[PDB]
Design a protein around this nucleic acid. Structure first.
Ligand SMILES: [Mg+2]
Ligand SMILES: [Mg+2]
Lengths: 77, 76, 77, 76
DNA sequence: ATGTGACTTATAGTCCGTGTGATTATAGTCAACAT
DNA sequence: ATGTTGACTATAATCACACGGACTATAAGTCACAT
């Protein structure tokens, strides 16, 4: 659909694997459906900031460092 | 209320103000609704990334500089 | 594929719903995959007695009462 | 070892004996392997439902009477 | 006749993911009247 | 100009499930030698 989204979902998946988490853990750890997390990662979802926040607490990562990785992903080529 | 959600709004307002833009104008520019934008700016809406993106296009700021600012604001 | 199996999986699903459990409770409660329970219930699986035992403890049901329902299901026309 | 698994085997042995069948004969009759049946009967195999079903056909007993017996045996 | 041990292969059981239909909560959009 | 209040609809988010490919553990099936 949209630029920022595909970047957001790329970063969530990048962190998650970096931390050796499976989708499963992530979903409990961050209080969303197992399906929701999957659906984000197939970039098929446009999440709310509140949800983003919950995912960030899920990845055990600070808002700051998350956005620092966003920025970097946006910049690749 | 959410901490992040409130810094995002603070920033939107900040950028709009640095640009001497009214809400009415931000709403026109981004094709969203004045009542919408008002609501965000008093932190009474929790917006979807897509909406954020539309507001960024209206402020006329790149996602990169938006998040650069957001980080700065978050850090106090 | 086989007579007894379709009867066994019919009974597991019958008890589970009777107890208002979803597949995933069942799967944790009984220490098997979420997928395994599903696959049994689509009667696509031929389980070990040990696994059966684990499912029975899962449904919070005695071996006895389980087989009493087997018998009844085998009998139904 | 499993309690159920051991009553199942006890029963198989019981039915075979009430029929005066040898293992060799139960193996032939059910098209499985003598060493397989031996192993079950000293509770050293944890068999699939399918196999159980094969052994039941070899004993020549209906699932219904098998489980009737299994319950009785379970109850001590 | 039965028991045991060792070995191979077929498949039970595990683990991590994709995809979806149905339902509930809430964001996305707008009117009215406010200042 | 901005703020606030509802009502309306579109979709974010939830909940019970099915299905898949890849992988590990173990049952299913045979010999060998045993008694
Ligand atoms: Mg929840
Ligand atoms: Mg386990």
């Amino acid at each position: 659909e949209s630029f920022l989204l595909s970047k957001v979902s790329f970063v969530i998946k990048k962190i998650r694997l970096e931390k050796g988490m499976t989708q499963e853990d992530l979903a409990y750890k961050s209080n969303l459906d197992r399906t929701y997390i999957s659906g984000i990662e197939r970039n098929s979802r446009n999440l709310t900031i509140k949800s983003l926040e919950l995912i960030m607490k899920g990845l055990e990562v600070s808002d700051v460092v998350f956005f620092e990785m966003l920025i970097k992903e946006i910049l690749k080529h």
